Amino acid sequence: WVMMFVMLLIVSAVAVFVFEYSFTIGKAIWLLWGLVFNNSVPVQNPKGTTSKIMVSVWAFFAVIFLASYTANLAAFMIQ
Amino acid sequence: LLWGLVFNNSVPVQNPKGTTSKIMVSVWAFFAVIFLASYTANLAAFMIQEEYVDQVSGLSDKKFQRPNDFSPPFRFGTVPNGSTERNIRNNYAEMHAYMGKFNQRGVDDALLSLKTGKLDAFIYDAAVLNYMAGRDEGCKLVTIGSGKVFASTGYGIAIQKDSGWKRQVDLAILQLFGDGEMEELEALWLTGICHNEKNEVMSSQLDIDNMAGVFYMLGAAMALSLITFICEHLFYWQ
Amino acid sequence: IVTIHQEPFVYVKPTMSDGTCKEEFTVNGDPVKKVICTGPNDTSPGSPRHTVPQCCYGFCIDLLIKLARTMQFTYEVHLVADGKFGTQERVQNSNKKEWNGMMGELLSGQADMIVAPLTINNERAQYIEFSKPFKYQGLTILVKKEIPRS
Amino acid sequence: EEAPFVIVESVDPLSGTCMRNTVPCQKRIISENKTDEEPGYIKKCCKGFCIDILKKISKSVKFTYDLYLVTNGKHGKKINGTWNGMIGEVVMKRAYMAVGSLTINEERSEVVDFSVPFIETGISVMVSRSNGTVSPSAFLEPFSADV
Amino acid sequence: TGELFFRSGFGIGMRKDSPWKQQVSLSILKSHENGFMEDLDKTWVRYQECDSRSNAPATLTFENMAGVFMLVAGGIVAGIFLIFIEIAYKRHK
Amino acid sequence: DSRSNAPATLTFENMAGVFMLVAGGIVAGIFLIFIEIAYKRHK
Amino acid sequence: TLDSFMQPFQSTLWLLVGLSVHVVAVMLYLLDRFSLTLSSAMWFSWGVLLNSGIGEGAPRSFSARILGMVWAGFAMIIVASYTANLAAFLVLDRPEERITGINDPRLRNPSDKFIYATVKQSSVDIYFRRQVELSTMYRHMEKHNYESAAEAIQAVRDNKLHAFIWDSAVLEFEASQKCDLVT
Ligand SMILES: *[C@@H]1O[C@H](CO)[C@@H](O[C@@H]2O[C@H](CO)[C@@H](O)[C@H](O)[C@H]2NC(C)=O)[C@H](O)[C@H]1NC(C)=O
Ligand SMILES: *[C@@H]1O[C@H](CO)[C@@H](O)[C@H](O)[C@H]1NC(C)=O
Ligand SMILES: N[C@@H](CCC(=O)O)C(=O)O
Fold first, then answer.
1. Would you give the distance in Å from CA D80 to the centre of its chain?
2. C-alpha dihedral over C45, C49, C55, C60, to 10 degrees?
3. For residues E75 and B29, what is the distance between their CA atoms, to the nearest angstrom?
4. Is F10 within 8 Å of A68 (Cβ atoms)?
5. Among D77, D78, D79, D80, which is best to mutate for testing ligand 2, by the most ligand atoms less than 8 A from CB?
6. Phi and psi at residue D12, in whole multiples of 5°?
7. Which of B99, D4, E93, F8 lies deepest, with the highest CB count within 10 Å?
8. C42, C54 in Cβ contact below 8 A?
9. Whose CA is nearest to atom 6 of ligand 3?
10. Which ligand gives the minimal distance to the CA of D83?
11. Which parts pass through the membrane (chain G)?
């Protein structure tokens, strides 16, 4: 949990650095926190090629992390 | 919107207005969560209780009658100078020659060739192969189906013709059968380790062989979409 | 020939009003070979002690036809009276013992062969001759399974 | 000799004989080629599934025997009108009975007289269980097209 | 349920002084090597009409999960019965 | 303590391969963001 | 070994899905101008598989409005099969054997590839050399016996012994203090 939270903060800092090339840190961390707990919360997406690729790679992280959690939990309830 | 809401809402959509629209979409959204959660759970149950299938169906398969009509030909053979060779020779000639061009020298050599990929199938006696399948380093070797003979016969004692001990031997064998000694002998000498209940081997590939249905469905869908496109174009042109 | 009512081996169906057996085909359009059986009536030979012709077909009926063509002999199949397989009992508390059913009808001279799923054991092998086995099986237990509830 | 029915081993090097619960069997050896060697046998020990049945038969009906091993061919084959192996030995009368994994068939039942069978057998095919399975429509195994 | 015990086969009973007792045993062994008794087995004994199983993965049908279909319909009918109340809510309040 | 099923909780190094993917993409992206910045200047 | 990316799907499936996403993307572009911008096709085709909201592109033509619905339905099947397959790894394991006890086929018929013994001059020896059904097991056991109970347990740890028969009061104490053995 903390091992992914530190990388979340790193990605937020990278997005802040890319923003140089109204996107503050609050919306960034909100979007990056919602994207991994099933994106449900209304959020605003950034602009340009850099923002789009950073969010797409983070979105692939979320799909794999969420699918292995439900599978592991199912194994514990069955055994 | 109503089609996207049930296949994981991903597609950009616009929501309606007012109290009526909001309540109708919220009740439909609850339908989607329950329908999607029971699908993954049911699919997981099928993969955990799946069951394998045999490669061939017996000696009357297409691979044994027409070996050249496939991939690099199927390799099967037996050891000569026995009863199975005499049985195969009188019923199948081309198959007899094809399996005789792949002769062997023993049971252990045949098992080694089958384990080292140098052979695909081995035809021999039933009890010997059952014993070899029930006693192996691991349970890699198996018999087709679940254990089945094709030429029913049994082991007997060869005595001289027109003798006087045949009736006594038969009566003694039937008495041993009626007392229960055969079960003890088979439990002592004919026991096995492998050949348990055929559970799943927990396959770890899910390659194109299993996942071709979704690609076929996508191809059919895109073909139908192109057909509808050209039909609408021809209708608008007229 | 003497047979017994066994569903996987011998079917016993009544004849029509004409007297012959009705035709019947299999799933691949080939005719089924039947024969004219003659045994007891429907219920039992006890009160209605009379015989009526019937129809026979099954696993043990088409096997006798193959033996009749290879060995070139004629047969006349009928059903056992009491409906038993055969066992040795005591008769009126006497010093002698006798068989019954299909086993006691062959030794009495009322039959020549027994085409039926008769189990080869040690007690019956001391009086008659059995041939090589035509079907390998054994004993098991038959029970009723439960229904699951989701 | 077979894998589960007739096991052949060596005698005890301490006492020079076979262990208990076994049967002493004697195979002959031919080493010389230019000259004919006098009859010389070795002493082995035979046991297995058929040996216990033979012991029980010999205990039921009183008779004595002396096992030995075949050296002419294997189970029996008819070559140019002459039977080899155990089938040929019983036919030219040097053996009286043959015990082992001999299967009753029509070609051999015209020169010998088999007994009631004590175990069932036949023809089978052995293949190696591959890592694959069967699941072409696993995605359609869930809810049918009605829902 | 269970394994097999007292394994003995079926045979044809004939009297001891029968001349046919030798020609019958030579015809049964001949019908086991040419495939004659396997046509008789797949015709009468082997059409297995109802398959058995232990795990039996069962696919859910319409009536299996029909309770979830009822929820959408119920909500929609109550919603109009409630939409009219909502329409009257904007007129009175 | 012994067991047969032994439900094992996944640790950090157990699924560390997925953490590497985000970092790798981010470093290549700047090495690619500079190329993207030069892409707007030259093209 | 938790091959996160390589365990559920094979190496050939990851490349076939990654190539089919471009086939549907450029198809939506051709279905627009024949009845979206070069950039709309790229995100919208990737915005449904990765489950992320990027851009506002949407097919306007009726001919492309049906291709997208099947495209969305194809991503849910992959994710549902991804989780279901991953759940088969942690519940199903390889069938172990482990000697069932004294009636095991490996002990009744001993060979030269399985070694088992006990301590010499104890009451385990008297139990085996007294019954006649245990004659074939005693001869194979007599030639491998050790001197004490502290040297035979170490042999099992160094893979020089296969099985060791002793009292349950002592063998259940080493199995609890040494987590690499089992009874
Ligand atoms: C099957 O029997 C034949 C006999 O016809 C065996 O063939 C001979 O093999 C021996 C052993 O090397 C040679 O000494 C002979 O010269 C061979 N004779 C002929 C005519 O080829 C054959 O080896 C046997 N095969 C098996 C597997 O037992
Ligand atoms: C076969 O017949 C006899 C022995 O049975 C012999 O004289 C003849 O030479 C043999 N021929 C061959 C080819 O074996
Ligand atoms: N039992 C066979 C040999 C083994 C086999 O052919 O499978 C025989 O006596 O001829």
1. 24
2. 40
3. 12
4. yes
5. D80
6. -70, 120
7. B99
8. no
9. B82
10. 2
11. 11-31, 66-82
Beta-sheet pairing, D120-121 with B153-154? antiparallel
Q: Would you call G84 helix, strand, or coil by DSSP? A: helix
Chain B CB within 8 Å of residue E31 CB: no
Q: How far is C18 from chain D (nearest CA, A)?
A: 45
Q: What are the CA-CA distances from residue C58 to residues C3, C6, C139 (Å)?
A: 11, 9, 22
Resolution in units of Å? 3.1
Cα G110 to the center of its chain, rounded Å: 31
Helix (H), strand (E) at residue A9? helix A2-18
Q: What's at D130, amino acid-wise?
A: S
Q: Are B122 and B77 a contacting pair, CB within 8 Å?
A: yes
Is the Cβ pair E59, D143 closer than 8 Å? Answer: yes
Q: 10 Å Cβ neighbour count for A48?
A: 13
Tokens 């027994």 — which residue?
C114
Cβ contact G28:G59 at 8 Å: yes
- Alpha-carbon gap, residue E56 to A44, rounded angstroms: 48
What are the E-state strand segments in chain D? 7-9, 23-25, 44-47, 78-79, 82-83, 97-98, 120-121, 123-128
Contact indicator for G51, A36 with CB cutoff of 8 Å: no
Q: At residue C40, what are phi and psi to the nearest 5 degrees?
A: -65, 175
| CA distances (Å), origin E25, targets B157, C1, G29, G97, G144 | 16, 17, 80, 45, 54
List CB contacts of E89: < 8 A, sequence separation 6 or more: none
User: Ligand 1 in contact with B81 (CB < 6 A)?
Assistant: yes
Pocket of ligand 2, beta carbon within 6 A: D 80-81
Dihedral in degrees, nearest 10, Cα atoms B27, B31, B36, B39: 170
Give the integer Cα–Cα distance in Å for A27 and A43.
Answer: 7
